[PDB]
Amino acid sequence: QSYGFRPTYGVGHQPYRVVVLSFELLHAPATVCGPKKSTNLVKNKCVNF
Amino acid sequence: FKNIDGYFKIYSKHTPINLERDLPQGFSALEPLVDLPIGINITRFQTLLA
Ligand SMILES: *[C@@H]1O[C@H](CO)[C@@H](O)[C@H](O)[C@H]1NC(C)=O
Numbered sequence: 001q002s003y004g005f006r007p008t009y010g011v012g013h014q015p016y017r018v019v020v021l022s023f024e025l026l027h028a029p030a031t032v033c034g035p036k037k038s039t040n041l042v043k044n045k046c047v048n049f
Numbered sequence: 050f051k052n053i054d055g056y057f058k059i060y061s062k063h064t065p066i067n068l069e070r071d072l073p074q075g076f077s078a079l080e081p082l083v084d085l086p087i088g089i090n091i092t093r094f095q096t097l098l099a
Contacts, residue, residue, distance in 0.1 A: 028088050029055035 050094075057085035 005015050041049070051058035060079035 028086060031086055 052091045055086060055088055057087050057091075059083050059085060 003015070004013065050060075059082040061082050062077050062079040064073075064077050066073055
């Protein structure tokens with residue numbers, strides 16, 4: 001069955017775009033990792049690295 | 050080629066021969082080329098010829 005999808009329908013009948021993100025593991029070791037941010041490095045000083 | 054737990058290691062090296070005999074003498078260490086992260090078991094291999 002098809003929807004109407006007219007711009008005059010209420011919020012209960014308006015179309016919605018849904019994106020689902022499913023996470024998997026134990027298949028491949030670390031293939032999709034998040035963003036690893038970094039900082040500006042300095043020298044000639046005792047600093048943790 | 051190596052089949053470690055989660056990284057198919059690949060090593061390569063190129064050296065001249067200039068002679069026609071068995072494998073030459075001298076050492077030639079192969080350097081790593083790519084990690085190839087895969088978790089697939091490998092027990093058989095073949096050679097691709099043209
Ligand atoms: C691949 O090797 C692992 C480790 O020995 C084993 O647990 C698994 O059952 C193997 N899978 C296949 C399809 O042979």
